[model samples]
Target: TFVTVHEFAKELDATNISIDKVVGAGEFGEVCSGRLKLPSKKEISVAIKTLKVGYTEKQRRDFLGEASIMGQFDHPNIIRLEGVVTKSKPVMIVTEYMENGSLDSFLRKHDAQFTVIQLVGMLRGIASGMKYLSDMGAVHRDLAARNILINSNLVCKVSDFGLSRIPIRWTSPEAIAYRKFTSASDVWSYGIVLWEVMSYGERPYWEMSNQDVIKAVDEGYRLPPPMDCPAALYQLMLDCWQKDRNNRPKFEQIVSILDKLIRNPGSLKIITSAPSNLLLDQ
Candidate 1:
């Protein structure tokens, strides 16, 4: 809704950019890693989202329109929009390149290699970023590990805005059933992200079907704690998943809880092991 030419006036010259490789797929096209030569003659790695060759004017406009929205953000925990290359062919939206890629795959690759405190630090960074977005009255409808970008420093930034999310897995019961998305639903999704990180990127619900997941969540079935997941951390996830949306903790409270945990690392020692059934299955 905030799309405007004036909003995205810092356009990058297409000649200054060079595509490296296809890194990931976007809804409209492939996201590539590239080198963007800045006006100061400095070359920087960047992620570029190119509009699929065959598209209508609406598609092109809608594509760059997201850039306008991202431009409004200035938080260190949020993805930095470099600029847009709309005046040239293969219109693109450039952003700071996250070397480690999305949070899900990054955690998956590292699997159980990090200390508890380090993992919590990653979660803390995410919560701080989300707290910023929440304070700005922005409802990040798609809040999941896959949507979070991770840089070399382990900084996780909220990104991939406007595209969307999974149909069921990361969605709240209310959001799935009624199409009503609010910050509360975002909290529910955040709970799933917490689970993902704790599990080192294991798929949420594993083999559960969408229909079954919806029914189970509505019937009060919640995800069990991941392996070696701290009891207190799991409890925070439960708080985020409270059935009553209004009962769920806000982003501010989430950040505070995480901050407290960070200060007192001992609280994370009491891990809640995965269920026996899960262990046996493995």
Candidate 2:
């Protein structure tokens, strides 16, 4: 349940939150940068996303729904919500500022800068956050690098609680066909997200029209591992995209596998499929 409007006023100082520096555009109005002064005189940097101008009452309810969702989580790997300003003008959703911004754009700008293990580290952080939500029966239908945020210390945190339905390219076959957003379907999307991170934010399907990409997945054509991607990691990615959702590894399982990979560096060594080792590759 959402907090009362009066609570919103007590939680924030409208006069102290001056949001004019535009950070990014949201589904609503512009997401801006701001500083909030606490009663104790602590200054905090935040991002303020306003409800889009001219919205219906139901739209308003849905717009504020993010606060309630984020309020349910308090993991270090997940984005922290400062508060929601429902009682103030230009009602906003306030979150702590991420210095490095979204993972997709950040990787694209610094492509080839990270070693394979470093990339794995980022994926591990994302999986850690997802695992927390999956434990509570929450499915992140749109889990992508773009939805993952990064900080100055290079710590990755899963953000954006998927307020609306998104493009089908990142969606699993079962979800696209049956509109199911189960934990299993989330794994499928995470597989594609692994591709995005491995490829340093290269667009999935690489110019293949959306309709064509959907058709390819239906025919069971998984993307080839990104160039220089570790064999074991790509193997894990394939495990996530299993045709049968029941066969897909749970997000908690993903965390464990990644921990093993990171600790046993020798395990990250690429292996040749068949002949030498019986390998079932995608």
Candidate 3:
């Protein structure tokens, strides 16, 4: 039988599931690291995301939606949802623990540590996860490095579906027509993720406000190459961020390109050969 919200809470407290750390936090909730003791006394490490009180109705709906969606996905590249505890004071979503934490933290600590092949492999892992989401007709509206988790084996898993949404079409004239997330939006976010990986986890638009970043993106201002980023990778980033979303390649295509890069690092030499004097002549 599935554990109800009340039972889950009682287990958490009575069993003294030791919360080891706070892995992540956001405007609506925080993720804590913990270990649960099963009936068999088998200790299982898990990540617990607890939503704060006073959440707006919309926020609550979104949180529940994320939990529902996460429960349905079981790919290796996707974070596994164990269960949830809603009867508790703070509703908690349980998930598999990722020891290495977010991809952003991992990259920050080992930016220059990965060779070209290793980086490509990491990208491939993310792309595969994205492909699965796309196949399910869902788009991860937020696809930044901060939402990716890295395991001990350096494997990647896409996490944090708080911004994820299912696409729908509306025809009613009275209905407020909001554009549902399309694959294109996913590509845009994917481009930003590529930039994050290339820049060693630097924030998008460093030192710039959200408005500034949006303005820059609207005006076609792309991220510059990091000290050690390959030029080819930069070009790929551009392809993903194309203004016409339809022009952007699908996740499968991205996987193919990254696979090629993994097999042939020398192909990136062409990017390095470009003239440094060339600049965006807007």
Best by lDDT: 1
Candidate 1, 1-282: lDDT as tens digits? 222553754788898999989877887788898899999999999999999999798887788777776777778888999998877878888998999988999999889999888888888888888887777777778888988989998888989777532458889888888887888888899988998999899988888767887787787888888888899988988888888899999988988998898899999999885331222111
lDDT (tens digit, per residue) of candidate 2 on 172-239: 88888888778888888888889899889987777777777777778787777777778887888788
Instruction: List, in order, the clash count of every candidate structure.
Output: 0, 0, 0
> Would you list the rank order by TM-score, best first?
1, 2, 3
Give one digit per residue, the lDDT tens place, for model 3 in 35-87: 87766788898887777877787876667667776766778999987776655
C-alpha RMSD values across all candidates: 3.3, 4.2, 6.4
What TM-score does structure 1 among the candidates reach? 0.91
lDDT of 2 at 76: 83
- Candidate 2 ranges with C-alpha deviation above 4 Å: 1-10, 52-54, 271-281
For candidate 3, give the lDDT. Answer: 0.71
What does the lDDT read for residue 158 in candidate 2? Answer: 84
Model 1 clashing-pair count: 0
Worst 10 residues of 2 by lDDT: 272-281
CA lDDT, every model vs. true structure? 0.83, 0.79, 0.71
Runs in model 3 deviating more than 4 A are: 1-18, 21-30, 37-42, 51-62, 87-90, 166-180, 209-212, 268-282
User: Over 4 Å off in model 1, which ranges?
Assistant: 1-9, 163-166, 273-282
TM-score of each: 0.91, 0.88, 0.77
Which structure among the candidates has the greatest TM-score? 1
